[PDB]
Design a protein around this ligand. Structure first.
Ligand SMILES: CCc1nn(-c2ccccc2)c2cc(N3C[C@H]4CNC[C@H]4C3)ccc12
Lengths: 296, 291
C-alpha cells in the first residue's frame, strides 16, 4: 500500500484579488483574477502531491467543461482520479472567492449543485490494497460511517504492519457529523466547530472533546494564528506555535494545507509533535503566497 | 465563411464574464456561505448590443480583446449561442479576459460589485487598421480608449470619401461613462448616444436639457440621442426639432441603443427609431436575459 486517498469535495474556485473587502452596495476593482481547483479533499491532494506523496482523489463530478478543467489540473499534479464517482444529475460545484490582499482574508460564496455525494456503495467498489492512508472530509455522515466500518473490517484481517491508517475531519458545526468523532486514528476538528460547541481555546476544546474519540486516537485542533494543539491516549497536551509569514496575502485552503502536511508527516513515521510542527510550517508558508506553487 | 458585401453591423467594445450570485444576506469578510443561485453571463456593452441585433435578425459582428483560456472559451461559445460573428476578435498575448463578480442580496435588492481587472489591452487603431471594411453597412463604437478610437473613426471617414452615397458606412458612437477623455468622441458619428449618467454628471437634469446643452459638440448633420429611464427618450438632429417618445413600462440601455441602430439601419426615420427603441427595451426589462 503506497498511496494516500482523500475522500471529499472538488470545486472550481473563481478568485478575485482585492486590496480591501467591498462595502455592501459598493463597487471595487480587483487587482487580479484566476481559477483554482478547490474543495477540501481536492486541496489536500495538491499539497500531498507537491510534497512528494503519491495520492488519489475520490469525490463526485459531472462531466462537462468544468470537470475537464479540474481533471486536467489533477493530472498535471499527478493526482490519481481513477476513483472518481462520475455522475449525470447536477453540475460540478463552483464558487466566488474574494481574497483580501491586505490580510489574506477569504470570503467564499459557494454554489452546491445537488450533485449526489459519494455513497457507501461507491466506496465498496474500491481496492483498499493500494492505500497506506485514507482521509475523509466529513460531509454525508450516515453513509461515511459505513465506509469507515469497511476499513476497520479490512484492518482486523491484517498484520499490525499492513493496516490502513484513517484520518477524519469534522469541519462543520453540524450535529449529524459528531458521529464521526468517532472513528479513525487521527481526528481533525476545526476552530469554528470548537467555538460553536462553546469552547474558546484549543486546549479547552481538546479536553472537552477527547471523550468522544476511539480508544487510542489522536485528536487535533488548529487555531489559525495561535498555532495548533493535539492530545492523545497519554493525556499529554501537545502544542506548536504558528509560523506566520511577514505579509499574509491569501489564506484560502490554509487549513487544508495544514491537514495534508500533518498526514504526510505522520504517514512517514514522524511523531505527533513533529507532525504538528510541520503542519504549522507548511500552512504558514502557503499564507504568504497566492495559490499553492511556491511552498516547495 | 463568405460575408456578403455591406451586410453586417459591427460593434466595437468590451466583453466580460459576469458571475452573478443571489444571496440571503451580505456575507461578512472571511465567511463561507451558500448562495441561493449562481449564474454565469456574458456582459459588456458592445457584447450585449450584438446579442440584441442578432435576435432582431441583423447579421452582426463583435470586435473586442480576449486572451486564450477557459473564460474566453465560455465567452466565445455564448457569443455563438446567440448567432454573433466572432471572427474580428483581437486576441492578446498579454493579460486577462475580463471577469466580474456580482453579489445580489435577496432580502433588500442591493447590488455589490467586484469589477474586472485592467490587465487586458484595449483594441488599438493598428489592430483596427487590419480590418477590411466592405463587409459592414454600419459600425458602432462603445467609447472606451478615446484617443485610439478617434483614429478608427478617421479611418472610416477616409474610407467613405471614395464611395457612392449608397455604399457609405454609417457610424454611431456611445459615451456611457462620465470620463473627460470620452467627450472628444461627440465630434464623430452620424449618431451619438449619451447616457443619463453622463448628462447628469455634466449637470443636466433631463434629456431635453442634455440634448440642447451638448448638440454644439457633434459634427454637422449628426443626430444626438439620450434615453432617460421611465421618462422615455429624446433625439435632436440638424433641423433643430426635438423628437420624443414615451416609455413602455413592462442591459436595457444596450437593448435601447441596439434597437435604435437596427431601425435606422433598416431605413426608418429617427422618430420611428426612438419609438421602436422604446418598445423593445420595455419588453427587455420585464424579462430575464435577452431571450
Ligand atoms: C496552524 C495552521 C495555520 N497557520 N495559519 C496562519 C496564517 C497566517 C498567519 C499565521 C498563521 C492559519 C490560518 C488559518 N486561517 C483560517 C481562517 C480563514 N481565513 C482567516 C483565518 C486564518 C488556518 C490555519 C492556519
Amino acid at each position: 500500500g503506497s498511496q494516500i486517498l482523500c475522500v471529499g469535495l472538488v470545486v472550481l474556485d473563481v478568485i478575485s484579488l482585492v486590496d480591501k473587502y467591498p462595502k455592501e452596495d459598493s463597487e471595487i476593482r480587483c487587482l487580479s483574477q484566476r481559477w483554482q481547483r478547490g474543495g477540501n479533499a481536492s486541496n489536500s491532494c495538491t499539497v500531498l502531491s507537491l510534497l512528494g506523496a503519491p495520492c488519489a482523489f475520490m469525490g463526485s463530478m459531472a462531466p462537462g467543461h468544468v470537470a475537464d478543467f479540474l481533471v486536467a489540473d489533477f493530472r498535471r499534479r499527478g493526482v490519481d482520479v481513477s476513483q472518481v464517482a462520475w455522475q449525470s444529475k447536477g453540475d460540478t460545484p463552483s464558487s466566488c472567492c474574494i481574497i483580501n490582499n491586505s490580510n489574506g482574508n477569504r470570503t467564499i460564496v459557494l454554489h452546491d449543485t445537488s450533485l449526489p455525494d459519494v455513497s457507501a456503495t461507491d466506496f465498496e467498489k474500491v481496492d483498499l490494497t493500494q492505500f497506506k492512508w485514507i482521509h475523509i472530509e466529513g460531509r454525508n455522515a450516515s453513509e461515511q460511517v459505513k465506509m469507515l466500518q469497511r476499513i476497520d473490517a479490512h484492518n482486523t484481517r491484517q498484520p499490525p504492519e499492513q493496516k490502513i491508517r484513517v484520518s477524519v475531519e469534522v469541519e462543520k458545526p453540524r450535529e449529524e457529523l459528531f458521529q464521526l468523532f468517532g472513528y479513525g486514528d487521527v481526528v481533525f476538528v476545526s476552530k469554528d466547530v470548537a467555538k460553536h460547541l462553546g469552547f474558546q481555546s484549543a486546549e479547552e476544546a481538546l479536553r472537552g472533546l477527547y471523550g468522544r474519540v476511539r480508544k487510542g486516537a489522536v485528536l487535533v485542533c488548529a487555531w489559525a494564528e495561535e498555532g495548533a494543539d493535539a492530545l492523545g491516549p497519554d493525556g499529554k497536551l501537545l502544542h506548536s506555535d504558528a509560523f506566520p509569514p511577514p505579509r499574509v496575502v491569501d489564506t484560502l485552503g490554509a487549513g487544508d494545507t495544514f491537514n495534508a502536511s500533518v498526514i504526510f508527516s505522520l504517514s512517514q513515521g514522524r511523531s505527533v509533535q513533529e507532525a504538528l510542527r510541520f503542519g504549522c510550517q507548511v500552512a504558514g508558508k502557503k499564507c504568504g503566497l497566492q495559490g499553492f506553487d511556491g511552498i516547495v
